Amino acid sequence: FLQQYRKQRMEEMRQQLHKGPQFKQVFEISSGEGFLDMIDKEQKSIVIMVHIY
């Protein structure tokens, strides 16, 4: 029953006890040009994940 992933619970455990300092908030893009020059700029070999909401 390894598929049930008992390790998921402890993954949540140390994700909860991750760090000490403030956890910060997700950056919010306020303008379309902001999104455009955010993706256009920044290093190419770094992954950028955008969440439409």
Partner: protein
């Protein structure tokens, strides 16, 4: 498009003057007022809803402040102060925020007039030096060899938490954990509550069954049912390297032309596994713990020697087991030595709790690491209990490192305030007013205790001040449960000098840091 000529960016906002100082001071005051009611033996708990869906039920100042997201940078500074206080001494987190807020309020009083902030800062620093001197003067020593007094100190530390109902059990657990994790090597003493003295919380059962184990407990089971689940006096061997055949670092393609080479290669894989297992067995152990995988063939060869094997153990857990059972982790099995075998663990047993298997090594002689097994109503209750136990262990370590002791219940605050007020009478300058104001700002702790107890703040505080004006009344504070004046050498509420020193220093320096700002610029790009 349309081009407006600009010096700075469009999204750059700048404000300065009295507005900035007032905003900073009110932000600090609001941060203090958030947790004002979570101080004292009669504090009320708060529910914090995580952005991730969790729930935090606590009256600890650091958790409440860290769970709150703020925009004003002064509030961010205050939260950082709370975290610093928690990390340094582990106690006094709620007191330092209130003290900083009160000091910033009494500073704002002067900044409303025509007094420059630098004068207030210099007066604050003089006052801080005098507070340190007075605190060191009124402190008393403690005998670390006296278990009763140490338990009393831990109790007075935890009387303000939800775990205070089971005070004796919690105090004994904390004292035993701190004492046994205490270590000495190469002339360097250490405690290291962070790495060792692990707290494991298993929901269910009763909290009266919680105890500190004479060893280490992990959430693991044997790799195969034929393993022995109960060994009387095990000899434990710890490893990091896998007990399975693995690829090498270099590209090592083979080229098979003869018929038997394939079966030969498989046979040598099996033979390598057997050789590793025989090298392990040569030390004649009973338990083998590995941070990585163990092959099935390795399990079989270990069974032939009647050896219990556990795999995929975390590095921190393996280090804790090494400290508990007196073993040394070995990477290459062929380099195992007799002194690397862990002898000293007086029992190993895998028992089932609920619907899960847990591995117990809980009869060690002189263990240097421990597992604090917490059982309780649910997950949040156990999280709060763990936080309280962490506070107790931090206080115990602070007392062990610094055997100075300071009266609690606001008695030290009033004593230091009276001493500073008496000292201020012989300065005759312009700095005497901020000096006296920040001296009297320490009275916010007894006032908060009286307010939380529900008694009359003004009458009790006036009586306490009048009592402290006497000749030997430095230990007179307020009873936080009955709202009456009492001598703390009779009530017994005492706190480490280190906690008080850290609280006063951090509060005064927070006030100094926030008093130096008159201009705020925001909105600019990070540029990096």
């Amino acid at each position: 498009g349309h081009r407006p000529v600009l010096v700075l960016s469009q999204n750059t906002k700048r404000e300065s003057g009295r507005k900035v100082q007032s905003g900073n001071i009110n932000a600090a005051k609001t941060i203090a007022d958030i947790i004002r009611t979570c101080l004292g033996p009669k504090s009320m708990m708060k529910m914090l809803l995580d952005p991730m869906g969790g729930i935090v039920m606590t009256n600890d100042g650091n958790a409440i402040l860290r769970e709150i997201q703020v925009q004003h940078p002064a509030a961010k500074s205050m939260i950082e102060i709370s975290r610093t206080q928690d990390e340094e001494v582990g106690d006094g987190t709620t007191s330092v925020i209130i003290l900083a807020g009160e000091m910033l309020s009494v500073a704002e009083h002067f900044l409303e007039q025509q007094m420059h902030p630098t004068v207030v800062i210099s007066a604050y620093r003089k006052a801080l030096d005098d507070m340190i001197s007075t605190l060191k003067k009124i402190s008393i020593p403690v005998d670390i060899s006296d278990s009763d007094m140490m338990l009393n100190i831990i109790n007075s530390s935890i009387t303000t938490k939800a775990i205070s109902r089971w005070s004796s059990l919690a105090c004994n657990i904390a004292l035993d954990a701190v004492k046994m994790v205490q270590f000495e090597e190469n002339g360097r003493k250490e405690i290291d509550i962070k790495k060792y003295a692990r707290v494991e919380k298993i929901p269910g059962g009763i909290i009266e069954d919680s105890c500190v184990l004479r060893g280490v407990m992990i959430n693991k089971d044997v790799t195969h049912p034929r393993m022995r689940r109960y060994i009387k006096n095990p000899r434990i061997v710890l490893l990091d390297s896998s007990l399975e055949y693995k690829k090498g670092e270099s590209q090592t393609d083979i080229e098979i032309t003869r018929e038997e080479d394939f079966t030969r290669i498989l046979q040598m894989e099996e033979e390598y596994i057997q050789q590793l297992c025989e090298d392990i067995i040569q030390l004649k152990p009973d338990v083998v713990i590995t941070e990585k995988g163990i092959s099935d063939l390795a399990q079989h060869y270990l069974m032939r020697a009647n050896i219990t094997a556990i795999r995929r153990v975390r590095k921190t857990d393996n280090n804790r087991i090494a400290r508990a059972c007196g073993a040394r982790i070995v990477s290459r099995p062929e380099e195992l030595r007799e002194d690397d075998v862990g002898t000293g663990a007086g029992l190993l047993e895998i028992k089932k709790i609920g619907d899960e298997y847990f591995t117990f090594i809980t009869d060690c002689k002189d263990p240097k690491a421990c597992t604090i097994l917490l059982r309780g109503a649910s997950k949040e209750i156990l999280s709060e209990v763990e936080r309280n136990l962490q506070d107790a262990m931090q206080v115990c370590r602070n007392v062990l490192l610094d055997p100075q002791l300071v009266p609690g219940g606001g008695a030290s605050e009033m004593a230091v305030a009276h001493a500073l007020t008496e000292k201020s009478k012989a300065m005759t300058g312009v700095e005497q007013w901020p000096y006296r104001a920040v001296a009297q700002a320490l009275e916010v702790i007894p006032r908060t205790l009286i307010q939380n107890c529900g008694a009359s703040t003004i009458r009790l505080l006036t009586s306490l001040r009048a009592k402290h004006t006497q000749e030997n009344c430095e230990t007179w504070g307020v009873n936080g449960e009955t709202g009456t004046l009492v001598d703390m050498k009779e009530l017994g509420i005492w706190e480490p000098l280190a906690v008080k020193l850290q609280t006063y220093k951090t509060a005064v320096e927070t006030a100094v840091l926030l008093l130096r700002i008159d201009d705020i610029v925001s909105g600019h790009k990070k540029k990096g």
